[PDB]
Design a protein around this ligand. Structure first.
Ligand code: CLA
Ligand code: CLA
Ligand code: CLA
Ligand code: CLA
Ligand code: CLA
Ligand code: CLA
Ligand code: CLA
Ligand SMILES: CCCCCCCCCCCCCCCC(=O)OC[C@H](COP(=O)(O)OC[C@@H](O)CO)OC(=O)CCCCCCCCCCCCCCC
Ligand SMILES: CC1=C(/C=C/C(C)=C/C=C/C(C)=C/C=C/C=C(C)/C=C/C=C(C)/C=C/C2=C(C)CCCC2(C)C)C(C)(C)CCC1
Ligand SMILES: CC1=C(/C=C/C(C)=C\C=C\C(C)=C\C=C\C=C(C)/C=C/C=C(C)/C=C/C2=C(C)CCCC2(C)C)C(C)(C)CCC1
Ligand SMILES: CC(C)=CCC/C(C)=C\CC/C(C)=C\CC/C(C)=C/CC1=C(C)C(=O)c2ccccc2C1=O
Ligand code: SF4
Ligand code: SF4
Lengths: 80, 31, 31, 773, 75, 154, 103, 31
């Protein structure tokens, strides 16, 4: 599966969970921003690698990085 | 003058249409 | 002459034995 | 009905001219990067992302139509000015066969005057000139132009008509603009585009042919010169002048009102094919043509029901009841919804209309070489290659746009509530079967046409000419097409299926080689305008190439249409739009998944289709039709000679060059593409030297495309990072940010330059070959 | 194709259409026994009688050549 | 009416190409689907049909075919070459079927790997036999397509 | 038969398409979206075509989880339905809740 | 002319298809 990393530059804008086609991400409580929440990925086995979360992250460099790795049925987007 | 093989081929195209319609009516009559 | 002898072999010899084997399958297999 | 029109929506100002990008919200914030510049141009005619109100959208489309008809009248005026000031038309009317037609010269500056052909030099036009290939002069001779001042009057009238179309656009947008209820009464607009636009158009054209074009062409064919009468053989006061040309019935329009129609059988005939004297259609058959289809178009505009204050009028059909009457058990609920589709979506109408007009331009390309319409036109061979090639290319482009706006409908204007269990819905329910079966028949056509060509390359290379799919080897005879040639050739005489025809449909069906008087320096008659066009094994093969290329272009564009909204890969593709680059490198990679990309791929596959079509036409017309009658014993000598095919036993057999050499790719390379490109590469220092320059420049533009086609923008953006560093080191800082081109726009630049380079290379090759011999 | 069509439940007729039996007699004496006999009379006057006397009438020239030179004014 | 689906989640349509009862009788009693048959016999009958028709394109269309060659001296070479061609095409099919078998098949047949190897074996024997049978009847088509008794004397 | 709904859910009216389930649903995994609707109304299938759904609880088996989540965002963005639940259905009949995971 | 044609038939036609079948076994069987 692909590798989803959340760094410490997150602002809690709620844009990487709204624009993700597969619900890989969710918000957990955190102390280091103003929204009080950081993104997390406990469902990386369903991620396809489509990088719509990387399109919608409003920082300088993206706080989310998905790394393209081992390919499964779910990650190659196969309905067969 | 007798008929040649292309006119037999046209008659067999016509008989293929007839055989398809025969097959359809015999199978629907089987229901 | 104007004959297709292979067609006589198909439709008078092969195809009736074919047809009797198909009707044997139709009248002897249960469901 | 009732023409419900609002008054003054838009004030006429200059305030939006100083603000580019006002029409879209992201463009209105100002240029920050350079992609705004390309986003300024790609969204200029997308009125649906500018305003959300469909009524205002329809008014923008309507004023755009008037402005386009204005620009087409400007172009029409531009060639009418060039035919009216700097042409050889005063001397081309006396020698249509020995003088090359020209309406443009190159002025005495930089050495370009070697471009002036001295076979266009005659009286008035004593400079030489650029030989044209549009066939405007033969059109003009057929409709009755004998003089350059009336060409000037047409030019002034076309500028006045351009001004009228611009004032109509400004009036019907800015002052008094129609509403959405006016556009959706499609019944009345069909009734007044059949009976009024096409019906009265060809009825008034029949009026032009009868009063002007048949007598002037009879004077040009009976032997008198350009000193003609244009005003005293007309109207009531010289009614007997209609009797001096070809006997105007008994007396006047009195046998029109009394019903004896047989006394007009001298200028409305049904004779048949082409005239032997001029190589073209009989003008009386043309007039009786446009009258019979004029009549049947006024009958065609009497079909659909329109209700109003007219009392007994209002009988007919509603289109919705016809569509909702045709249901079927295979097709569910049939055409219900398609009236609401075609009365609320502009893209669906544009898809149908681009399909029909592109198909019709291809139909036009076939029938105008097939029946020559205009006098001495079929012997001017650059015009024949150029109009076939032109109308083929315009036809293929409009078919690709048809697939485009069908997919744009499927992205934008598809409503699931309207399209419940109709044909449009159930096509989307079995789109996998359609695209997969289409994929299979494209594979079948490609193997069973191109692998035949590859087989012929192989067996001719291995020294096995009898093993070839050819007319001397494994014969693949087009027996259905040859049988239809025999039927359309045989259907003219007594005891046939069209008993009162003198000279058949066309001579291409298998009857007679037709030739015309022309000079060519100091020679004899020669000049086959038209001949029977025989079909053999090579025609089987090239037509299955054509079926292949048509079917792959269908497969690409139709896979764009049916998978526009969703797929098994991307179920939310309609939310991503018509025009997006990808949905990321995931799911293996989703590059070129948008329906726009299928328009992008279908553009090159249209290039393949139409290029092999015009290549077939060039070699085919050249090898079996076009050429010379020999001065001894009237023998046919074609433009390329016959080939004595070496058989496997040792002897030869005579075939023509298409029949011998167009069965493999080596003969296409050598005898078509190496041999006939000798006059485009040897053209320097002479009148065709520009066509050599366009040939080389179009090779450049075609190769220049492949930088944009084979690369992508992340390379270019980090390269522009290094160039932007070089600019910021020397205090040269643009506020508009230098960006790499976007992915979709880089694909668009690449397909634009690929298309421009290939078609202009092929244009240069065709015109520079066909001017020579 | 008509038999296969009339087995489909849109085109299957009702029992009342079968047991109508006046209209069946009217149509068989009119069309099946009379129009076919009149059509065969038309075949004999258009084809068989002129081809017995050496003059050939086929499916390309039947609209032009009459059975009789006093044609249809005598009717 | 004609097109139903009978499980509308499954991406298929039940159509008179699909669901006409004689088409189901034909497809369901082709030898791969005909009930009560060991996989070897299914392969055998598939091979016999295939190997019988596979002789034809090689003998009519192959490198040794024409009327401008050396008598019917080359005709025996044509029949033998087409025979070997159809048997080696059947051998390639056998190789295909048994590479399918030996790597472990997952399919709607209830064949095993062993069952697909029985199919591969029956395919090979039936295919080469169908090639040999089509070659013998092609050798016999002279007397087969005429009344042979009548030209020969006595 | 093979695609049996959980009890309480009813099938939406659909004519059947070719974009739907393949062999993988039989042998590896399939997915099931189940939502609530207040009327009988017309939506677009993620596998092509148009369907309508009755009032009450509706369920649909799809080949991929992205197809179900695309159907979920279509229900949110077009008909304001936010009680869609997505199950991963194994071939032995085991269903596990994967959306919403937080409840 | 000194040719071994049967050897050309072995290692240009038979042995490569042999080798692709063996490599197919190497890449498609588990353990
Ligand atoms: C008499 C001259 C004249 C003037 C001053 C205008 C001025 C204007 N037109 Mg207009 N128009 C005209 C003639 C004119 N038009 C004609 C002859 C047509 C038919 C082709 C149109 C059809 C038209 C459409 C469809 C639209 C406009 C629009 C506009 C506005 C935006 C200008 C812009 O950004 O593009 C720059 C153009 C140039 C620099 C040239 C602007 C105030 C837009 C509008 O009115 O907003 C709703 C709009 O979409 N015009
Ligand atoms: C240094 C390069 C150069 C320059 C400065 C020009 C300049 C010009 N060319 Mg030219 N040309 C060039 C290279 C160049 N050319 C090359 C390389 C080719 C071969 C592809 C041509 C082939 C060419 C043709 C055929 C013509 C020109 C014409 C013209 C004149 C345009 C004015 C006009 O249209 O009338 C104004 C028209 C109206 C107002 C109406 C202009 C002065 C045109 C000309 O001579 O004018 C009649 C003309 O027809 N050029
Ligand atoms: C008999 C009356 C009549 C005539 C002669 C026309 C003629 C035309 N219409 Mg029109 N139309 C009509 C009735 C008519 N219409 C009615 C009654 C309605 C409303 C129900 C419309 C609604 C309509 C629309 C929406 C459009 C046209 C357009 C056009 C132009 C098409 C361009 C062309 O054909 O090339 C040749 C050009 C000439 C011969 C000049 C053309 C000049 C199109 C257009 O281009 O707008 C300007 C288009 O937008 N028409
Ligand atoms: C829209 C097409 C059109 C127009 C504007 C005209 C106009 C005219 N025709 Mg004409 N005509 C036409 C089509 C047309 N025609 C067609 C289609 C036919 C063949 C059926 C004719 C056959 C015809 C004859 C025989 C005559 C006219 C005549 C005339 C002139 C006097 C009007 C009249 O006869 O009463 C007039 C200028 C008369 C005339 O002046 O001769 C040129 C006359 O003798 N026309
Ligand atoms: C009746 C004809 C017609 C009409 C009204 C439209 C209208 C439209 N099309 Mg369209 N289309 C058509 C035919 C038509 N098309 C054909 C024939 C094709 C096949 C080529 C296409 C393929 C197509 C695509 C792929 C797309 C459209 C899109 C659009 C929309 C916006 C386009 C725009 O903003 O302008 C902008 C125009 C430009 C930026 C010009 C581009 C550069 C041109 C092509 C180069 C010109 C070269 C020139 C011909 C020769 C060389 C000269 C040079 C050396 C100087 C608009 C609704 C776009 C859309 O988003 O739909 C909603 C889009 O995605 N069309
Ligand atoms: C010359 C280059 C080339 C070739 C050969 C192809 C070939 C093909 N294209 Mg492609 N294409 C090309 C350029 C080319 N394209 C370019 C530049 C683009 C960019 C715009 C595309 C974009 C494109 C799209 C978008 C599509 C295709 C499709 C296809 C397939 C069409 C089906 C067919 O023709 O039947 C048969 C195959 C051929 C004619 C190829 C040659 C086969 C030879 C003659 C047989 C060889 C014999 C044997 C196998 C060799 C064994 C030797 C052994 C040692 C291995 C076909 C395989 C379409 C498709 O997939 O439909 C089925 C499809 O939709 N093409
Ligand atoms: C179903 C039977 C049938 C049909 C389809 C026809 C059809 C025809 N008959 Mg005919 N006819 C028929 C029975 C038929 N007839 C019989 C039974 C007789 C003997 C009384 C005739 C005696 C007859 C004569 C004398 C003539 C025709 C003529 C014609 C043709 C002219 C159409 C017309 O004006 O009326 C037409 C194709 C006329 C003709 O000119 O033939 C081309 C004509 O001269 N018919
Ligand atoms: C084709 C003959 C034909 O039109 O058959 C008839 C059938 C549809 O006919 P219907 O009776 O449903 O037509 C009623 C309306 O839909 C048309 O007015 O077409 C099909 O089977 C679907 C096309 C599949 C194409 C298969 C390839
Ligand atoms: C579907 C169908 C169709 C088609 C069909 C076909 C396609 C055909 C065919 C055919 C064929 C294709 C046939 C075949 C055959 C065969 C055979 C009959 C064989 C054989 C063989 C043998 C007998 C062999 C033997 C052997 C062995 C095994 C071992 C050793 C060697 C030998 C030689 C002894 C149609 C539409 C028409 C109709 C309906 C149905
Ligand atoms: C340095 C410089 C320069 C130079 C440049 C160069 C070096 C170039 C080039 C270029 C090339 C190397 C090329 C090319 C080409 C072109 C082309 C290719 C074109 C075009 C176009 C057009 C306009 C088209 C037209 C047409 C059409 C429309 C279609 C049909 C055909 C024709 C042709 C008619 C210059 C002078 C600017 C100036 C200064 C600076
Ligand atoms: C009056 C007049 C004409 C003014 C001209 C206006 C003035 C002054 C400058 C305008 C700059 C110009 C003329 C071009 C810039 C285009 C550009 C940055 C290309 C780099 C690039 C290449 C080469 C690719 O292959 C490619 C492939 C796929 C995706 C992206 C790319 C890509 O980005
Ligand atoms: S990772 Fe990016 S998109 Fe997600 S919450 Fe943080 S800043 Fe927003
Ligand atoms: S390479 Fe370009 S088009 Fe392909 S997935 Fe990546 S960004 Fe998208």
């Amino acid at each position: 599966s692909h590798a989803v990393k959340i760094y410490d530059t997150c602002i809690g804008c709620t844009q990487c969970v709204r624009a993700c086609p597969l619900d890989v991400l969710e918000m957990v409580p955190w102390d280091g921003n103003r929204a009080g929440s950081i993104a997390s990925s406990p469902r990386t086995e369903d991620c396809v690698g489509c990088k719509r979360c990387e399109t919608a992250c409003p920082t300088d460099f993206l706080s989310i990085r998905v790394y393209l790795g081992a390919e499964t049925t779910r990650s190659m987007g196969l309905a067969y | 003058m007798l008929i040649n093989n292309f006119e037999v081929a046209g008659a067999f195209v016509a008989a293929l249409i007839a055989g398809f319609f025969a097959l359809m009516l015999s199978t629907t009559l089987g229901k | 002459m104007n004959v297709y002898p292979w067609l006589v072999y198909v439709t008078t010899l092969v195809f009736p034995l074919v047809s009797l084997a198909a009707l044997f399958i139709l009248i002897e297999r249960d469901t | 009905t009732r023409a419900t029109v609002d008054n003054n929506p838009v004030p006429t100002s200059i305030e939006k001219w100083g603000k580019p990008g006002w029409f879209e919200r992201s463009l209105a914030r100002g240029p920050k990067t350079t992609t705004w510049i390309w986003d300024l141009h790609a969204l200029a005619h997308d009125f649906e992302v500018q305003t959300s109100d469909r009524e205002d959208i329809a008014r923008k489309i309507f004023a755009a139509h008037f402005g386009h008809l204005g620009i087409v009248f400007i172009w029409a005026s531009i060639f009418f000015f060039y035919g009216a000031l700097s042409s050889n038309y005063a001397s081309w009317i006396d020698n249509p066969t020995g003088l090359r037609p020209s309406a443009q010269f190159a002025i005495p500056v930089f050495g370009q005057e070697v471009l002036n052909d001295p076979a266009t030099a005659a009286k008035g036009f004593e400079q030489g000139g650029i030989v044209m290939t549009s066939g405007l002069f033969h059109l003009w001779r057929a409709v009755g132009y004998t003089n350059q001042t009336q060409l000037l009057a047409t030019a002034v009238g076309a500028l006045v008509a351009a001004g009228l179309m611009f004032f109509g656009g400004w009036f019907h947008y800015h002052v008094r603009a129609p509403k959405l209820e006016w556009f959706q009464n499609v019944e009345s607009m069909l009734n007044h585009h059949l009976a009024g636009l096409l019906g009265l158009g060809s009825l008034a054209w029949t009026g032009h042919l009868i009063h002007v074009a048949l007598p002037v062409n009879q004077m040009l064919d009976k032997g008198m010169k350009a000193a003609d009468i244009p005003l005293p053989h007309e109207y009531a006061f010289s009614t007997e002048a209609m009797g001096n040309f070809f006997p105007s019935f008994k007396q006047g329009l009195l046998p029109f009102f009394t019903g004896n129609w047989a006394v007009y059988s001298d200028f409305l005939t049904f004779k048949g094919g082409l005239n032997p004297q001029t190589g073209s259609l009989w003008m009386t058959d043309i007039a009786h043509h446009h009258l019979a289809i004029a009549v049947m178009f006024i009958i065609a505009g009497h079909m659909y029901r329109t209700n109003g204050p007219w009392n007994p009028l209002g009988l007919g059909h509603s289109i919705k009841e016809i569509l909702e009457a045709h249901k079927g058990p295979f097709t569910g609920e049939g055409h219900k919804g398609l009236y609401e589709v075609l009365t609320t979506s502009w893209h669906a109408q544009l898809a149908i209309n681009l399909a029909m007009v592109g198909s019709l331009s291809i139909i036009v390309a076939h029938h105008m070489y097939a029946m020559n319409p205009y006098p001495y036109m079929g012997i001017d061979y650059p015009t024949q290659i150029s109009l076939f090639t032109h109308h083929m290319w315009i036809g293929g482009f409009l078919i690709v746009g048809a697939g485009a706006h069908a997919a744009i409908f499927m992205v934008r204007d598809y409503d699931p509530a309207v399209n419940q269990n109709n044909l449009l819905d159930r096509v989307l329910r079995h789109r996998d079967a359609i695209i997969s079966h289409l994929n299979w028949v494209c594979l079948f056509l490609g193997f069973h046409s191109f692998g035949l060509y590859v087989h012929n390359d192989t067996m001719q290379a291995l020294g096995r000419p009898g093993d070839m799919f050819a007319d001397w080897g494994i014969q693949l005879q087009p027996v259905f097409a040859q049988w239809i040639q025999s039927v359309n050739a045989a259907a003219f005489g007594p005891n046939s299926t069209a008993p009162w025809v003198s000279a058949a449909t066309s001579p291409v069906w298998g009857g007679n080689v037709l030739a015309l008087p022309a000079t060519v320096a100091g020679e004899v008659v020669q000049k086959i305008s038209i001949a029977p066009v025989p079909l053999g094994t090579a025609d089987f093969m090239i037509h299955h190439i054509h079926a292949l290329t048509i079917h792959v272009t269908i497969l690409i564009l139709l896979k764009g249409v049916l998978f526009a909204r969703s797929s098994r890969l991307i179920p939310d593709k309609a939310n991503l739009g018509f025009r997006f680059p990808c949905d990321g490198p995931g799911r293996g990679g989703t590059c070129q998944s948008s329906a726009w990309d299928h328009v992008f791929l279908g553009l090159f596959w249209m290039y393949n289709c139409i290029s092999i079509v015009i290549f077939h036409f060039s070699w085919k017309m050249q090898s079996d039709v076009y050429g010379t009658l020999n001065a001894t014993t009237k023998a046919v000598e074609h433009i390329v000679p016959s080939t004595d095919v070496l058989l496997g036993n040792g002897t030869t057999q005579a075939f023509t060059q298409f029949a011998a050499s167009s069965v493999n790719i080596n003969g296409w390379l050598r005898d078509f593409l190496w041999a006939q490109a000798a006059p485009v590469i040897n053209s320097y220092g002479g009148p065709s030297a520009a066509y050599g320059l366009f040939f080389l420049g179009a090779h450049f533009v075609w190769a220049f495309s492949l930088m944009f086609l084979f690369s992508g923008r992340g390379y270019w953006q980090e390269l522009i990072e290094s160039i932007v560093w070089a600019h910021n080191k020397l205090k040269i800082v643009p506020t508009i940010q230098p960006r790499a081109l976007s992915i979709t726009q880089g694909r668009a630049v690449g397909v634009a330059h690929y298309l421009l380079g290939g078609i202009v290379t092929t244009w240069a090759f065709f015109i520079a070959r066909f001017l020579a011999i | 194709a008509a038999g296969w069509l009339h087995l489909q439940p849109r085109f299957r007729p009702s029992l009342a259409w079968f047991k109508n039996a006046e209209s069946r007699l009217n149509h068989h004496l009119s069309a099946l026994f009379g129009v076919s006999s009149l059509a065969w009379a038309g075949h004999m006057v258009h084809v068989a009688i002129p081809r017995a006397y050496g003059k050939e009438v086929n499916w390309s020239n039947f609209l032009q050549i009459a059975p009789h030179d006093a044609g249809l004014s005598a009717f | 009416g004609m097109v139903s689906t009978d499980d509308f989640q499954v991406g298929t349509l039940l159509t008179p190409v699909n669901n006409s009862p004689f088409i189901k009788f034909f497809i369901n009693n082709l030898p791969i689907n005909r009930p009560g048959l060991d996989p070897f016999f299914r392969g055998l009958e598939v091979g016999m049909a295939h190997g019988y028709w596979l002789f034809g394109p090689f003998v009519v269309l192959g490198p040794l075919r024409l009327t401008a060659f050396r008598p019917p001296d080359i005709e025996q070479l044509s029949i033998l070459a087409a025979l070997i061609s159809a048997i080696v095409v059947v051998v390639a099919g056998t190789l295909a079927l048994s590479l399918y078998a030996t790597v472990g098949p997952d399919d709607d047949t209830k064949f095993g790997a062993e069952g697909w190897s029985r199919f591969a074996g029956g395919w090979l024997i039936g295919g080469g036999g169908g090639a040999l049978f089509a070659a013998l009847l092609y050798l016999f088509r002279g007397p087969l397509l005429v009344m042979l008794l009548g030209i020969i004397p006595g | 038969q093979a695609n049996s709904l959980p009890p309480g859910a009813s099938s939406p009216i659909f004519g059947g398409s070719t974009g739907g389930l393949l062999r993988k649903a039989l042998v590896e995994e399939k997915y099931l979206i189940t939502w609530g609707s207040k009327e009988e109304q017309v939506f677009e299938m993620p596998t092509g075509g148009a369907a309508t759904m009755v009032a009450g609880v509706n369920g649909l088996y799809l080949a991929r989880k992205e197809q179900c989540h695309a159907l979920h965002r279509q229900l949110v963005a077009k008909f304001k339905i936010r009680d869609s639940k997505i199950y991963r259905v194994l071939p032995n009949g085991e269903q596990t809740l994967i959306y919403p995971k937080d409840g």
